[PDB]
Amino acid sequence: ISVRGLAGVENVTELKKNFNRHLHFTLVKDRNVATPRDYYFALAHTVRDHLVGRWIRTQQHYYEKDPKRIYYLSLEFYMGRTLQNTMVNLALENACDEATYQLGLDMEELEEIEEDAGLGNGGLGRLAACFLDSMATLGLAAYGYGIRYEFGIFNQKICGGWQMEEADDWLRYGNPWEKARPEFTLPVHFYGRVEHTSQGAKWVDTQVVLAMPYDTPVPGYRNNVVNTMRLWSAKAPNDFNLGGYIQAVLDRNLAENISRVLYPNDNFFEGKELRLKQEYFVVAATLQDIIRRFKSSTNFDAFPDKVAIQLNDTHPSLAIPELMRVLVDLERLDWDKAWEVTVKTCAYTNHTVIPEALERWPVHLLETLLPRHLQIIYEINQRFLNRVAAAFPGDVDRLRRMSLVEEGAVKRINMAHLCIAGSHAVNGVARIHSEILKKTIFKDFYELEPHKFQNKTNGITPRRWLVLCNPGLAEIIAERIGEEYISDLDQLRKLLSYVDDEAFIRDVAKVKQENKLKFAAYLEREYKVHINPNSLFDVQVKRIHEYKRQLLNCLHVITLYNRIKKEPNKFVVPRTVMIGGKAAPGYHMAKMIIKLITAIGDVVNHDPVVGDRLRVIFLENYRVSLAEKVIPAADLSEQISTAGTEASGTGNMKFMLNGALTIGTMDGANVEMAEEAGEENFFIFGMRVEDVDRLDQRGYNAQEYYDRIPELRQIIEQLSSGFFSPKQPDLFKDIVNMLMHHDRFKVFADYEEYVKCQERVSALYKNPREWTRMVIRNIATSGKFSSDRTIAQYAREIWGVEPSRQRLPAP
Amino acid sequence: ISVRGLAGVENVTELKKNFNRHLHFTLVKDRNVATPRDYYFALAHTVRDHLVGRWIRTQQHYYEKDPKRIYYLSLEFYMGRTLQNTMVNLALENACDEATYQLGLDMEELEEIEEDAGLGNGGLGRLAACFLDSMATLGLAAYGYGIRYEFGIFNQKICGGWQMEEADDWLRYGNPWEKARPEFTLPVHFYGRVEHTSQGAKWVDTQVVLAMPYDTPVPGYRNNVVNTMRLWSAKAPNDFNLGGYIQAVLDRNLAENISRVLYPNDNFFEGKELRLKQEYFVVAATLQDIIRRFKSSTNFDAFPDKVAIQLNDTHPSLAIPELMRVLVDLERLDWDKAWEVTVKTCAYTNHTVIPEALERWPVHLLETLLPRHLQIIYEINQRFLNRVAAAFPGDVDRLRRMSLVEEGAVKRINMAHLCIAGSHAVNGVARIHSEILKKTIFKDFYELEPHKFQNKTNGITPRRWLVLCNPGLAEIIAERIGEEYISDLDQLRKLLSYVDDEAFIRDVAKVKQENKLKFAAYLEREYKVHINPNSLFDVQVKRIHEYKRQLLNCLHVITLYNRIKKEPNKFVVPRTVMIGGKAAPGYHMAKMIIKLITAIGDVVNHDPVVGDRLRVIFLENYRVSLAEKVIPAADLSEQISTAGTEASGTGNMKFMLNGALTIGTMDGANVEMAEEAGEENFFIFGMRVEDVDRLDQRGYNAQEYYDRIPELRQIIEQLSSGFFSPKQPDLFKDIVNMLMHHDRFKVFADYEEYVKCQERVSALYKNPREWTRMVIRNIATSGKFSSDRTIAQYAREIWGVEPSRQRLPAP
Numbered sequence A, B: 001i002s003v004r005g006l007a008g009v010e011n012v013t014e015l016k017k018n019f020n021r022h023l024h025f026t027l028v029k030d031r032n033v034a035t036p037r038d039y040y041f042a043l044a045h046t047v048r049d050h051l052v053g054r055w056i057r058t059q060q061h062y063y064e065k066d067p068k069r070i071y072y073l074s075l076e077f078y079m080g081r082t083l084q085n086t087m088v089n090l091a092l093e094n095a096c097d098e099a100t101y102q103l104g105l106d107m108e109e110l111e112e113i114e115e116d117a118g119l120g121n122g123g124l125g126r127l128a129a130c131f132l133d134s135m136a137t138l139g140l141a142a143y144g145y146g147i148r149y150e151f152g153i154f155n156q157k158i159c160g161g162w163q164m165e166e167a168d169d170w171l172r173y174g175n176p177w178e179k180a181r182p183e184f185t186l187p188v189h190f191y192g193r194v195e196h197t198s199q200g201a202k203w204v205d206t207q208v209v210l211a212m213p214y215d216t217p218v219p220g221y222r223n224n225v226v227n228t229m230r231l232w233s234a235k236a237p238n239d240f241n242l243g244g245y246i247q248a249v250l251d252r253n254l255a256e257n258i259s260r261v262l263y264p265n266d267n268f269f270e271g272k273e274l275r276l277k278q279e280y281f282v283v284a285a286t287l288q289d290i291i292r293r294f295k296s297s298t299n300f301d302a303f304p305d306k307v308a309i310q311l312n313d314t315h316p317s318l319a320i321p322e323l324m325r326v327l328v329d330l331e332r333l334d335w336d337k338a339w340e341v342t343v344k345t346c347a348y349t350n351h352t353v354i355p356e357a358l359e360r361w362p363v364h365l366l367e368t369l370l371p372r373h374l375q376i377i378y379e380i381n382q383r384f385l386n387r388v389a390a391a392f393p394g395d396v397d398r399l400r401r402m403s404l405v406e407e408g409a410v411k412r413i414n415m416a417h418l419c420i421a422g423s424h425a426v427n428g429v430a431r432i433h434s435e436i437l438k439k440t441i442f443k444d445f446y447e448l449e450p451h452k453f454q455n456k457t458n459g460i461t462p463r464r465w466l467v468l469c470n471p472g473l474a475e476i477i478a479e480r481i482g483e484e485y486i487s488d489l490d491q492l493r494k495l496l497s498y499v500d501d502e503a504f505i506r507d508v509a510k511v512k513q514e515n516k517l518k519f520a521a522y523l524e525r526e527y528k529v530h531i532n533p534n535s536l537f538d539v540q541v542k543r544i545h546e547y548k549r550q551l552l553n554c555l556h557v558i559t560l561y562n563r564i565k566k567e568p569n570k571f572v573v574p575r576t577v578m579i580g581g582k583a584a585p586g587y588h589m590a591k592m593i594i595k596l597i598t599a600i601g602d603v604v605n606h607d608p609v610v611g612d613r614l615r616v617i618f619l620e621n622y623r624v625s626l627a628e629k630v631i632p633a634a635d636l637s638e639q640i641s642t643a644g645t646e647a648s649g650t651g652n653m654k655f656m657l658n659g660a661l662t663i664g665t666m667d668g669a670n671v672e673m674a675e676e677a678g679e680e681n682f683f684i685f686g687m688r689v690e691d692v693d694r695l696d697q698r699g700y701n702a703q704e705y706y707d708r709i710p711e712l713r714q715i716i717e718q719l720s721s722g723f724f725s726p727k728q729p730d731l732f733k734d735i736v737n738m739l740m741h742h743d744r745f746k747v748f749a750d751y752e753e754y755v756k757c758q759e760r761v762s763a764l765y766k767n768p769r770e771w772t773r774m775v776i777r778n779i780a781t782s783g784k785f786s787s788d789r790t791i792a793q794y795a796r797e798i799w800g801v802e803p804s805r806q807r808l809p810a811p
């Protein structure tokens, strides 16, 4: 059936009886009243049972061996479903598939019942998840620490072509993968004031909120290692939080609101108090847990030798001043020793350069909520600027530019500057992004401490993003080069010698056609629409953002439609362009773009002259589980952000690994992907970072493009006149206005080159054999983009630990 | 070891391995890091496993056989712990005791870890729990329906002698006994308005709250029957309940607050909207569930033949108009047919006659929250008063007295009148209470429909209240008459022939001494105080209420103290008087009484001259699990409410069954207990109902008693001068003031007779042999107070079903 493992006679028999055991004793059901959800839960428990043993020994192991521990702090962990992932990493997939078959059930149908653990917004959150998988597969003693939101990313509904947000009550039916641990409940403080007494400062009269941990197992790939992802949940103390007795009890929900919902912002900062509370909550509980574990393993001199804390963006940046608070105020270490320790254990990862995404917290907020932390930040700033003054005497302007405190309307703390000053390493997520950080945004810091700056190009895990979602492709690859590539993706290079293999070429093309047929069916099954599986599947799925330019894609789609209407009887390569992604609730322009996409589809999809040559479909509720479905079925991957705006991107790597060709700009990781596959095997177009700068010096004037490109002007006039919105002719006035007068992302500037490039893609598609051979050269060179490579680099160049592919002593 | 069942070799082996299975797979622990709470949970799951099979077949059975179903609606179910109770009813106690012993654990230590399911205030709530146990033991197809409060009765803490309330977060570590069933989630409506259209009225524009059920198994005593207690939990819909996206999500907690906390009022009405919402919530979800089940089993003519709904007090009274709403508005039945059906399926139980406990809801509240129900209530009232007018022509005053609508300051709906009009049966809970209902409070209704009024004297379950909490006494009883009495308490009469048995007399006295020694140890273990186990254990435990007169007990205690101080070297029977119970948070006088008790103990307990002859101890956090501890250790049970105020009482029956003698007034069930044991074997005193009336006609003047009783006057002057409150001399001015000028319960009127009676109790105690022989005559005649008797009466005289002690076909 496939290398989903073996289906042993004894193993299948054991699984079946345990499945029946859980259906009965755990779910209290019998075959006569059990629903598919019951069946899913019986299977989940049966599979979960196989982790317990490994989980206990792995943790037991780390206790005995006492290795250096890696702590990955993130406010997001975009996990998705975990049933299939667990079976894969445990080699149980075929056995469970057989067992359920014999019990008369369809395992695939059961898998669709699991809810996605959508505790993330997009790229940043999914990177943390891929990293967790790689760290376990590489035998690192790593822990993922975050917040257990009871409501993750909202479920997206399209109503009248508009996005509607609906609460993601993912825990409604229960989460079999988490393990509550009330024995490690910790107190977190807020507000209060600072008292300066004889022997040190004291933070008093604070409001207490308890942090209760929930542990989720993270299994490595077939090595018997099971690490932990610890998510904190807010719980109110039962005393004080006890005017009215009834009210006092109902009011407990005020403290517990801290972990209620994930902020739905992607690459956008919103300075709300609740968000700051969430950030301190996760930091305060995590560091107590880290130090407690360390004390078991009081000279904190060896702290950095046993502890590494990785900050995923600046969200958990309060870890720096919190570590100082604990070491100086509680452990009574002298400032300088505490600072040496802090810098040596902390490392920071930057994920974007757009200004609106940078965390700049108003000082009055930190003053009220965390008074002691504000004082420590001021002291850190003081000493840091003294260092700068010494290094660049008289450079008064550099002084204000590098300050962690920004003066102006309202004073603010620049969390990124805080992170650079208190970390021994700072990294970008793609070569171009890391260079841009040194050359622009953090130039002053790089000049001060060049040794701190590094790069760690992102990656994705080949387990979920290949074996799990595309078993067919994984099978034909393994048939030729073996299975060793699953945890050593570089071996994919060996596929280069099959580029002329008539058999391989036919197989690769076959799995893609099967994936497209399956997705096409899913589209009609759960969404009822109908699409032609013979057309080119053009897809752009990611969060809706002006910088990602779903709008540039829209212009091309309209261009295609207009060319068809001009010469109806001319042949054109049929296309099914699918765009999907969620817009943050308060992001007006992004919501306007979603409406534009659905409006274009309303016209195009019902034009008889167009026929089945062009279909515009908006993919509803894009999330991890849906990505696993569309990506393997894609032919063309759209990665068209304005050069210099997408730090790295990861969806791009997912598409490359699954047999889709890429059309994109020289941005983020796109640059390194083309470098690995060869630019001849990539569809690159548009301005490079340098051209964008040149245009900015000159001054970007959209009118110029509108004046010189008839096809462009026709589109804009179609939008303004109401051609795509009959009942509301001026519906899209905002978009047209932005495009013409305030386009920070120069959509028009890349239009001509994009359309031309798209023409070249259509020409290659007309030649199946050659299209497929290029795909093979992409798949064969995607090895570098595995998160196992990324993690091995973080491990060796930042954390100071050696990865290991050694199987743990059985379960 | 005892008739806790057999400890089979195979059974103990099986239990041990399953215990280890759960500790590993369920709790993810190993013997090296498992805490006692883990051990408790492993045992709970092991025992719980033995119910699943029985639960499924019992429910399966009721489906096939299709008997008439009994639905017991209550806003309270005071369950207590359930581990030991489950082992008893399953005959697993000795086997589990052996198994844990061999695993090196103490089962008793593990049992103390379980949290009490305190979803009740006192008597009314505990009656529902005893009833559930009896209904299962009697093979009735019964379902208990209520609300799953996440916070039950508050935990009581004494600070500075004052009561402090603390949230009862009983679900913090999880509840292994409940089973969530999201597949039966039902919608409940609130607010909205009524539209009158062509074919009927419509309730529109309502706010929807979802009701999710949680099922808890209720095992019968060793008959393999397992019934269900279904508790509803409030859940917000994820759409509309989705101004701000974040706010919308945080605001879900407004709808879910409905099931957040139990109102801590005992025999007291508080007309708060949240409470009304809770009442409709449980009624609306329950009736949908009832009708759905009925439709499976559309002529609602047979509805009453298959359905019986028992209303525990007026709390679920909205069931009457809700049943009408559904039948008339949705099922489209004609009014009269719907009314015939409603009356025939509904029955109401009254639990008190004090006016402040009567539910009288303001019309403006029902108008806003349940507009359609208000209309139906008006129509019910209309037709009912027409009936009255026809029966008593011209009796205009009877008309207003019987109205369900009370005019005045604010119009109100008398929920009790609603219940009488819409039920085919109305019952009191003790013979005297039922007579008082007919003679006073509901006299007009009794004259209209005499056939409706009945009595069903309360009872307690002998499983929890004898076998579970007093195995020693249960063992010596069984040694002589067998085990059949456990489900046939009347057989206890056979013990009468052992009243002169020298061996029995010595045994009965022995178990009491052991129980007292054990409790005395527990007191020092968890509360550190020290008490003399040789003294007479004088206890009054129940909710603090003026009508229960903990104050009368206080006066006696002070009298004793004063007599000792007067003649220090005179001998007196040593006593340890223990008073315990919670005061509703807003009940000022009750909280003042708790402070009085602790203040008396502060003086008495530290007076050297008193020595160990008198100790006054206030029992902290009285609840079901504590009752199971004190009751078996008591010698004297205080049931001293003012004649005519305690409807029945049940604590009194618990004490009688466990070998304590009773000192009390001719009130509630006390009357029938003395009647069963013989007044010579009871310590009765004080005014009878008739004497209280006589005093009221005359006019109660406390000053008279103060003027004629020197000992009384001395006490009152001690309270006024600050003798019991040095730092705050006027601390108890409120109590003295009430006692002298506004004592609704005539404490002073029963003082003299009470003290004299107490002297007689002390004299009998001085004669161990005779004290014990009287105890035997009480225990031997307590058979009538088993809830199995009560339930068999409800079954035969109200519900129309026959109980059965037939074992269900194995598990």
Ligand SMILES: O=C(N[C@@H](Cc1ccc(F)cc1)C(=O)N1CCC(O)CC1)c1cc2cc(Cl)ccc2[nH]1
Pocket: A025, A026, A027, A028, A041, A173, A174, A175, A176, A177, B048, B049, B051, B052, B055, B176, B177, B178, B179, B180, B216, B217
């Ligand atoms: O709670 C039980 N089983 C779990 C089995 C289970 C466990 C985890 C999960 F994610 C889904 C189902 C369950 O259904 N839920 C707990 C977690 C969540 O709140 C949903 C309800 C349970 C079984 C059972 C048997 C008896 Cl006899 C009595 C009470 C019981 N409860």
Ligand SMILES: O=C(N[C@@H](Cc1ccc(F)cc1)C(=O)N1CCC(O)CC1)c1cc2cc(Cl)ccc2[nH]1
Pocket: A048, A049, A051, A052, A055, A176, A177, A178, A179, A180, A216, A217, B025, B026, B027, B028, B041, B173, B174, B175, B176, B177
């Ligand atoms: O949740 C698990 N077990 C239950 C075992 C259990 C079930 C009911 C109960 F009342 C107490 C304990 C539990 O500890 N809780 C669920 C209910 C409550 O929220 C407390 C935490 C669990 C075991 C386990 C093993 C693995 Cl390998 C992964 C996740 C897991 N979760």
Ligand SMILES: *Cc1c(COP(=O)(O)O)cnc(C)c1O
Pocket: A121, A122, A123, A126, A541, A542, A543, A622, A623, A624, A627, A648, A649, A650, A651, A652, A654
């Ligand atoms: C991989 C992934 C992303 C990141 O996509 P980019 O195109 O890099 O922005 C976002 N969302 C989901 C659901 C993903 O799987």
Ligand SMILES: *Cc1c(COP(=O)(O)O)cnc(C)c1O
Pocket: B121, B122, B123, B126, B541, B542, B543, B622, B623, B624, B627, B648, B649, B650, B651, B652, B654
């Ligand atoms: C039995 C019981 C009651 C009822 O006691 P009364 O003396 O009848 O008021 C109250 N609380 C608890 C904990 C009980 O067990």
Ligand SMILES: OC[C@H]1O[C@H](O)[C@H](O)[C@@H](O)[C@@H]1O
Pocket: A122, A123, A124, A127, A267, A351, A352, A429, A458, A646, A647, A648, A649, A650, A668
């Ligand atoms: O680093 C992980 C991801 O973080 C953010 O989502 C960036 O916008 C994206 O470019 C990057 O791939």
Ligand SMILES: OC[C@H]1O[C@H](O)[C@H](O)[C@@H](O)[C@@H]1O
Pocket: B122, B123, B124, B127, B267, B351, B352, B429, B458, B646, B647, B648, B649, B650, B668
């Ligand atoms: O009916 C059960 C109980 O209800 C209330 O608590 C009454 O006050 C009490 O007298 C009675 O025993």
